[PDB]
């Protein structure tokens, strides 16, 4: 069975994953049919990106997600869109963007005078 797995990357302490499509018989770090997202749990809101169209296609042909990938698919709403039960609502908690360095620089300059 073709499956939607998570392959591990990054260094020792920091696991960063790629949401790949691969046969169940291949090893974890083996060749991948497709890369359709990434998942970084080390971040505080744990960045998640999933290519919705490719995910829909691969679920349509019958690829089986693993449990973590199923959880991610439920989070992004792709799983529900594939099934159709509640609708496809984006529960994705995106990371809050950081203020620019220039903003803080000008703020410090203004605070000085």
């Amino acid at each position: 069975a073709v499956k939607i797995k998570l392959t591990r990357l990054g260094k020792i302490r920091n696991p960063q994953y790629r949401i790949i499509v691969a046969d169940a018989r291949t090893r974890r770090d083996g060749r991948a049919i497709e890369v359709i997202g990434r998942y970084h749990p080390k971040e505080e809101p744990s960045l998640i990106q999933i290519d919705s169209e490719r995910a829909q296609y691969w679920l349509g042909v019958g690829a089986q997600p693993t449990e973590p990938v199923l959880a991610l698919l439920k989070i992004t709403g792709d799983w529900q869109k594939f099934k159709g039960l509640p609708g496809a609502e984006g529960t994705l908690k995106v990371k809050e963007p950081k203020p620019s360095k220039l903003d803080l620089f000008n703020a410090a300059l203004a605070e000085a005078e």
């Binding site: 360095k101 220039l102 803080l104 620089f105 410090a108 300059l109 000085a112």
Partner: protein
């Protein structure tokens, strides 16, 4: 590691003063040791090596780190000389010293290594830290009343602050506008000799 032995030795050997206000170098401007007066043979390699030693003993950077800097500077799309000089000038300890907060580069490095500073709101104790555009370097509150910073903040009449930096607060904040260009660096020696040496 770090160079720890006497400082004027290097200045006497290299024929120029690197600290800036050293009376021992003025008293004897010739190389140290028994044969510090013997006439020397002239060779391009000697001059290039002496220039490199001047550069890497002014800033207190060891040879491997200096070679890494040179490779980085050559890789960049500018020209090698000023690129290397700007990479050297962007080190945190050099920024601290050039901001007038340290009389000598050695004590600037000592202060940085002891975690007396705080860059962009996060404690940084790494002299080789490179400083980008729009960085705010602050002294942590615990060390504001210390003797070194006390005497640093009431003798702000020494060497002028370069253009690319600006001490802006009564608490001696440091603001970095842009990485220095060759015109504003105001450093001894000649970068072209170093470029020649490392191309050998």
């Amino acid at each position: 590691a770090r160079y720890t032995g006497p400082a004027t030795r290097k200045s006497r050997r290299l024929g120029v003063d690197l600290v800036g206000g050293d009376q021992s170098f003025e008293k004897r401007p010739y190389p140290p040791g028994q044969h510090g007066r013997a006439r020397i043979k002239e060779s391009e390699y000697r001059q290039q090596l002496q220039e490199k030693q001047k550069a890497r003993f002014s800033y207190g950077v060891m040879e491997k780190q200096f070679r890494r800097y040179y490779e980085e500077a050559n890789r960049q799309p500018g020209k090698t000389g000023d690129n290397l000089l700007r990479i050297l000038e962007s080190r945190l300890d050099n920024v601290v010293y050039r901001a007038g907060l340290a009389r000598t580069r050695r004590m600037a490095r000592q202060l940085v290594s002891h975690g007396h500073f705080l860059v962009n709101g996060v404690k940084v104790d790494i002299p080789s830290y490179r400083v980008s555009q729009y960085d705010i370097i602050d002294v942590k509150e615990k060390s504001l009343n210390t003797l070194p910073f006390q005497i640093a903040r009431e003798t702000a009449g020494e060497r002028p602050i370069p253009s690319w930096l600006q001490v802006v607060g009564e608490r001696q904040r440091i603001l970095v506008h842009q990485l220095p260009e060759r015109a504003q660096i105001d450093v001894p020696l000649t970068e072209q000799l170093i470029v020649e040496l490392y191309s050998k």
